[PDB]
Every structure is written in structure tokens, then in C-alpha cells.
Design an enzyme around this catalytic site. Structure first.
Site, PDB file in Angstrom:
ATOM      1  N   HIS A 134      16.000  20.057   4.367  1.00 58.42           N
ATOM      2  CA  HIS A 134      15.123  20.113   5.538  1.00 58.42           C
ATOM      3  C   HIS A 134      14.073  21.199   5.314  1.00 58.42           C
ATOM      4  O   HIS A 134      14.125  22.298   5.874  1.00 58.42           O
ATOM      5  CB  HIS A 134      15.935  20.346   6.808  1.00 58.42           C
ATOM      6  CG  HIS A 134      16.720  19.148   7.244  1.00 58.42           C
ATOM      7  ND1 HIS A 134      18.085  19.048   7.080  1.00 58.42           N
ATOM      8  CD2 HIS A 134      16.328  17.987   7.825  1.00 58.42           C
ATOM      9  CE1 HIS A 134      18.500  17.884   7.546  1.00 58.42           C
ATOM     10  NE2 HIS A 134      17.454  17.221   8.003  1.00 58.42           N
TER      11      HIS A 134
ATOM     12  N   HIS B 123      10.575  17.444   2.710  1.00 54.85           N
ATOM     13  CA  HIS B 123      11.117  16.379   3.551  1.00 54.85           C
ATOM     14  C   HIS B 123      10.114  15.960   4.618  1.00 54.85           C
ATOM     15  O   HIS B 123       9.934  14.763   4.877  1.00 54.85           O
ATOM     16  CB  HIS B 123      12.428  16.822   4.199  1.00 54.85           C
ATOM     17  CG  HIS B 123      12.847  15.970   5.357  1.00 54.85           C
ATOM     18  ND1 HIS B 123      13.063  14.613   5.247  1.00 54.85           N
ATOM     19  CD2 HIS B 123      13.085  16.283   6.653  1.00 54.85           C
ATOM     20  CE1 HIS B 123      13.416  14.127   6.423  1.00 54.85           C
ATOM     21  NE2 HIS B 123      13.438  15.120   7.294  1.00 54.85           N
TER      22      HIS B 123
ATOM     23  N   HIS C 123       8.222  17.278  12.621  1.00 47.74           N
ATOM     24  CA  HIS C 123       9.453  16.941  13.335  1.00 47.74           C
ATOM     25  C   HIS C 123      10.637  17.829  12.970  1.00 47.74           C
ATOM     26  O   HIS C 123      11.641  17.805  13.690  1.00 47.74           O
ATOM     27  CB  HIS C 123       9.822  15.474  13.093  1.00 47.74           C
ATOM     28  CG  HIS C 123      10.543  15.236  11.804  1.00 47.74           C
ATOM     29  ND1 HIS C 123       9.887  15.019  10.610  1.00 47.74           N
ATOM     30  CD2 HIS C 123      11.868  15.178  11.521  1.00 47.74           C
ATOM     31  CE1 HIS C 123      10.775  14.841   9.647  1.00 47.74           C
ATOM     32  NE2 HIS C 123      11.984  14.932  10.174  1.00 47.74           N
ATOM     33  N   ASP C 124      10.560  18.605  11.885  1.00 48.74           N
ATOM     34  CA  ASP C 124      11.664  19.473  11.487  1.00 48.74           C
ATOM     35  C   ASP C 124      11.222  20.917  11.290  1.00 48.74           C
ATOM     36  O   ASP C 124      11.867  21.657  10.542  1.00 48.74           O
ATOM     37  CB  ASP C 124      12.331  18.958  10.209  1.00 48.74           C
ATOM     38  CG  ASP C 124      13.458  17.981  10.489  1.00 48.74           C
ATOM     39  OD1 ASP C 124      14.052  18.055  11.586  1.00 48.74           O
ATOM     40  OD2 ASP C 124      13.758  17.145   9.610  1.00 48.74           O
TER      41      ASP C 124
ATOM     42  N   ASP D 212      12.031   9.073   8.963  1.00 45.50           N
ATOM     43  CA  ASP D 212      12.862  10.264   8.817  1.00 45.50           C
ATOM     44  C   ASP D 212      13.960  10.066   7.778  1.00 45.50           C
ATOM     45  O   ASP D 212      14.320  11.011   7.067  1.00 45.50           O
ATOM     46  CB  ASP D 212      13.473  10.633  10.172  1.00 45.50           C
ATOM     47  CG  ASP D 212      14.029  12.038  10.199  1.00 45.50           C
ATOM     48  OD1 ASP D 212      13.825  12.781   9.216  1.00 45.50           O
ATOM     49  OD2 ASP D 212      14.671  12.404  11.204  1.00 45.50           O
TER      50      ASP D 212
ATOM     51  N   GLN E 257      27.743   7.930   1.630  1.00 51.16           N
ATOM     52  CA  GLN E 257      26.428   7.301   1.669  1.00 51.16           C
ATOM     53  C   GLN E 257      26.526   5.839   2.080  1.00 51.16           C
ATOM     54  O   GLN E 257      25.676   5.343   2.827  1.00 51.16           O
ATOM     55  CB  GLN E 257      25.743   7.431   0.309  1.00 51.16           C
ATOM     56  CG  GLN E 257      25.301   8.842  -0.031  1.00 51.16           C
ATOM     57  CD  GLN E 257      24.235   9.364   0.911  1.00 51.16           C
ATOM     58  OE1 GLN E 257      24.537   9.881   1.987  1.00 51.16           O
ATOM     59  NE2 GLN E 257      22.977   9.236   0.507  1.00 51.16           N
TER      60      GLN E 257
HETATM   61  C1  LIG Z   1      24.437  12.867   0.427  1.00 55.54           C
HETATM   62  C2  LIG Z   1      25.556  13.691   1.067  1.00 55.54           C
HETATM   63  C3  LIG Z   1      26.111  12.937   2.274  1.00 55.54           C
HETATM   64  O1  LIG Z   1      25.044  12.595   3.170  1.00 55.54           O
HETATM   65  C4  LIG Z   1      25.528  12.077   4.334  1.00 55.54           C
HETATM   66  C5  LIG Z   1      26.884  12.066   4.637  1.00 55.54           C
HETATM   67  C6  LIG Z   1      27.309  11.522   5.843  1.00 55.54           C
HETATM   68  C7  LIG Z   1      26.394  11.003   6.754  1.00 55.54           C
HETATM   69  N1  LIG Z   1      26.883  10.484   7.894  1.00 55.54           N
HETATM   70  C8  LIG Z   1      26.206  10.513   9.065  1.00 55.54           C
HETATM   71  O2  LIG Z   1      25.100  11.015   9.255  1.00 55.54           O
HETATM   72  C9  LIG Z   1      26.955   9.865  10.237  1.00 55.54           C
HETATM   73  N2  LIG Z   1      28.114   9.103   9.745  1.00 55.54           N
HETATM   74  C10 LIG Z   1      29.278   9.366  10.606  1.00 55.54           C
HETATM   75  C11 LIG Z   1      30.484   8.573  10.128  1.00 55.54           C
HETATM   76  N3  LIG Z   1      30.188   7.132  10.151  1.00 55.54           N
HETATM   77  C12 LIG Z   1      31.345   6.369   9.659  1.00 55.54           C
HETATM   78  C13 LIG Z   1      29.020   6.859   9.299  1.00 55.54           C
HETATM   79  C14 LIG Z   1      27.814   7.664   9.765  1.00 55.54           C
HETATM   80  C15 LIG Z   1      25.035  11.017   6.430  1.00 55.54           C
HETATM   81  C16 LIG Z   1      24.597  11.558   5.226  1.00 55.54           C
HETATM   82  C17 LIG Z   1      23.239  11.579   4.920  1.00 55.54           C
HETATM   83  N4  LIG Z   1      22.357  11.996   5.842  1.00 55.54           N
HETATM   84  C18 LIG Z   1      21.039  12.040   5.589  1.00 55.54           C
HETATM   85  C19 LIG Z   1      20.165  12.479   6.581  1.00 55.54           C
HETATM   86  C20 LIG Z   1      20.235  14.008   6.687  1.00 55.54           C
HETATM   87  C21 LIG Z   1      20.550  11.640   4.349  1.00 55.54           C
HETATM   88  C22 LIG Z   1      19.184  11.680   4.073  1.00 55.54           C
HETATM   89  C23 LIG Z   1      18.571  10.285   4.258  1.00 55.54           C
HETATM   90  C24 LIG Z   1      21.432  11.204   3.370  1.00 55.54           C
HETATM   91  O3  LIG Z   1      21.030  10.848   2.263  1.00 55.54           O
HETATM   92  N5  LIG Z   1      22.797  11.173   3.655  1.00 55.54           N
HETATM   93 MG   LIG Z   2      15.896  17.033  12.713  1.00 60.72          MG
HETATM   94 ZN   LIG Z   3      14.043  14.976   9.408  1.00 58.90          ZN
END
Ligand SMILES: CCCOc1ccc(NC(=O)CN2CCN(C)CC2)cc1-c1nc(CC)c(CC)c(=O)[nH]1
Ligand SMILES: [Mg+2]
Ligand SMILES: [Zn+2]
Length: 290
Positions: free
Chosen positions: A78, A82, A118-119, A214, A247
Site C-alpha cells: 500500500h 499501488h 484512495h490509499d 483497486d 489467493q
Molecule cells: C498474497 C498473500 C495473500 O493475499 C491475500 C490473502 C487473503 C485474502 N483474503 C481476503 O481478502 C478475504 N478472504 C477471506 C476468506 N475467504 C474464504 C476468502 C476471502 C486476500 C489476499 C489478497 N489481498 C489483496 C488485496 C490487498 C491482494 C492484492 C490484489 C492480493 O493479491 N491478495
Molecule cells: Mg484501502
Molecule cells: Zn487500495
């Protein structure tokens, strides 16, 4: 004036095609800070925002440097890069995605500012919508700072309208708000009921479009997405075997339906959905190898 503002204001701004900012596969790893600032100027220019709102060149340059400086480089994901990538995806969805013709000039102006802001001042995920109100407050302070007032060319009516769209757009990047409001957006889409002439559905679409940009790193080519995921993992855990499944769950729960719905609104946004699907394959294959 500092040395940064002098050299940025005097530099040549290459075309959008030279800078590759129209491609959904755009990546910033090889760009310097000055180069991302030039890309941002080109985004404002090719969206006709400098023309239609009489922005002074040194004011826009000063505003961009203020926004960039108010992100923290010590935060792995962030940060300014980004924000810059989020705005680039907004530009590509407007241009290559052909969403620009569905929106007004004030909506486009607000979306681009909101994407970049936004961040603002983010400290990292380890360090409602409390944070997004702080982000918008940082954005408003920069917009009113002397020499940075890129909205000065707007009348009060346009200015008040733009500030409300910016505020709604920044608040929309709260994933809790996205989860609460996306059910209505998918209802209208699957019922062939979605209409952008409705002010309520238009504002809902702007909220979904902010989230799609985003999260757009999830749509990038596999070498790039693998690198961005490394940054996210660093911020989540440091400031590996379970990352591939995390992921996959993130793509299934959040990303896929959004980019599918966005493709329904504009067929030319399909590269985002297609890159998201390909990344799910790559992550799922790694999850099964653990
Ligand atoms: C790469 C290391 C792990 O990253 C993550 C790990 C877990 C989550 N889970 C969630 O956000 C919600 N889960 C709750 C449980 N539910 C079963 C599924 C949904 C998201 C990420 C993640 N968020 C972002 C945005 C910051 C990005 C950038 C696009 C990204 O690449 N990965
Ligand atoms: Mg934010
Ligand atoms: Zn963002």
C-alpha cells in the site's frame, strides 16, 4: 520549488502508446518515480481533464508530487506504486475498456483523482470505513493546499459535485462496503435490469469500478501477479505454502464475480476477467503441489 518539481515540469510527456498505459497488462517495475509521474500527467491529458478544466501544468505537477510524497515507501504494497497502478487500470478501463463514453467529464475527473488518492497515508494492514475517511481527508487537504489546487478551474457547483464523487469513490474501496453493496449490482446484472441512466445505479457502478481497479493486480500476467503477491505477503506477514490457496479463495470470493460483472457492462474489459482466470489456474496448480 524543489528540484523534483522543476525537472518534472520541464520534462517531455511521452504519448499514451509509448508509455503503454492503455494496456491492461501494464507493469511499473521498470519505471522510476519521475516516470510514473509522467504517466500520471499523460492520464490526465488523454482523458481531456487538463483541457476541459484549465489545469495549470505546474499545479498538476505539484499536485502529483504531493500525492506521491504522502504515500509511505516503507509499506510494501500500500504505497504510491499501488495507487499509480490503480489509476492506470482506471485509465485503461476508460480508454481500452470503452467505459469513458458511459460517464461524464466530472465523473472521470473524480475517478482518476480518487484512484490516485484512495490509499493516501496508508501505514500497512498490520499497523465503519474509518481508514477510507482518513484517506479522503488526506486527499482533500492536498486538493486545497496552495499551488496544488487542480480543481480551481471548476465552478462551485462542479466542485461540490466532484468532491462528493471523490469521497464516495474512496469510501467504496472499503472491501466491507463492496461486499455489502455488490449483491444489488449482481442482481441487476443477472436480471438484465442494469441501467447507467439511473443515478443510483450509476453511483453503484462507480463504486464497483473503484474496487475492480483497486484489486487489478490480481488480473496481471503471471510473472507480474507473482511479484505483486510477494509484496502483499510481505505487508501481511512481515511488517508461503498457504499463499497459493489463500489467493484462490480470494479470487473466488471477491474478484471473479466482479470482473465478470464488469465485462457484462463493457465487453472490452474482458482482459481483466481473462487475466484473473489465468491467475486462478496458476495459483490453484501451486496449491495442489503443497
Ligand atoms: C498474497 C498473500 C495473500 O493475499 C491475500 C490473502 C487473503 C485474502 N483474503 C481476503 O481478502 C478475504 N478472504 C477471506 C476468506 N475467504 C474464504 C476468502 C476471502 C486476500 C489476499 C489478497 N489481498 C489483496 C488485496 C490487498 C491482494 C492484492 C490484489 C492480493 O493479491 N491478495
Ligand atoms: Mg484501502
Ligand atoms: Zn487500495
Amino acid at each position: 520549488e524543489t528540484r523534483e518539481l522543476q525537472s518534472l515540469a520541464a520534462a517531455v510527456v511521452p504519448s499514451a502508446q509509448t508509455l503503454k498505459i492503455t494496456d491492461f497488462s501494464f507493469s511499473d517495475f521498470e519505471l522510476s518515480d519521475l516516470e510514473t509521474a509522467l504517466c500520471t500527467i499523460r492520464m490526465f491529458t488523454d482523458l481531456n481533464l487538463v483541457q476541459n478544466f484549465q489545469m495549470k501544468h505546474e499545479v498538476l505537477c505539484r499536485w502529483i508530487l504531493s500525492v506521491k510524497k504522502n504515500y509511505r515507501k516503507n509499506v510494501a504494497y500500500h504505497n504510491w506504486r499501488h495507487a499509480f497502478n490503480t489509476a492506470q487500470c482506471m485509465f485503461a478501463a476508460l480508454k481500452a475498456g470503452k467505459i469513458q463514453n458511459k460517464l461524464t467529464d466530472l465523473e472521470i475527473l473524480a475517478l482518476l483523482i480518487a484512484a490516485l488518492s484512495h490509499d493516501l497515508d496508508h501505514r500497512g494492514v498490520n499497523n465503519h470505513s474509518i481508514m477510507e475517511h482518513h484517506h479522503f481527508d488526506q486527499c482533500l487537504m492536498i486538493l486545497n493546499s496552495p499551488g496544488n489546487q487542480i480543481l480551481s478551474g471548476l465552478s462551485i457547483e462542479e466542485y461540490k459535485t466532484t468532491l462528493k464523487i471523490i469521497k464516495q469513490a474512496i469510501l467504496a474501496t472499503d472491501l466491507a462496503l463492496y461486499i455489502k453493496r455488490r449483491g444489488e449490482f449482481f442482481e441487476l446484472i443477472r436480471k438484465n435490469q442494469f441501467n447507467l441512466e439511473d443515478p443510483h445505479q450509476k453511483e453503484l457502478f462507480l463504486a464497483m469500478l473503484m474496487t475492480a481497479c483497486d484489486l487489478s493486480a490480481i488480473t496481471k500476467p503471471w510473472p507480474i501477479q507473482q511479484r505483486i503477491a510477494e509484496l502483499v505477503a510481505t505487508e501481511f506477514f512481515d511488517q508461503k505454502n498457504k499463499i497459493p490457496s489463500m489467493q484462490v479463495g480470494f479470487i473466488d470470493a471477491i474478484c471473479l464475480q466482479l470482473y465478470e460483472a464488469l465485462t457484462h457492462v463493457s465487453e472490452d474489459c474482458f482482459p481483466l476477467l481473462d487475466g484473473c482466470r489465468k491467475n486462478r489456474q496458476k495459483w490453484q496448480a501451486l496449491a495442489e503441489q503443497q
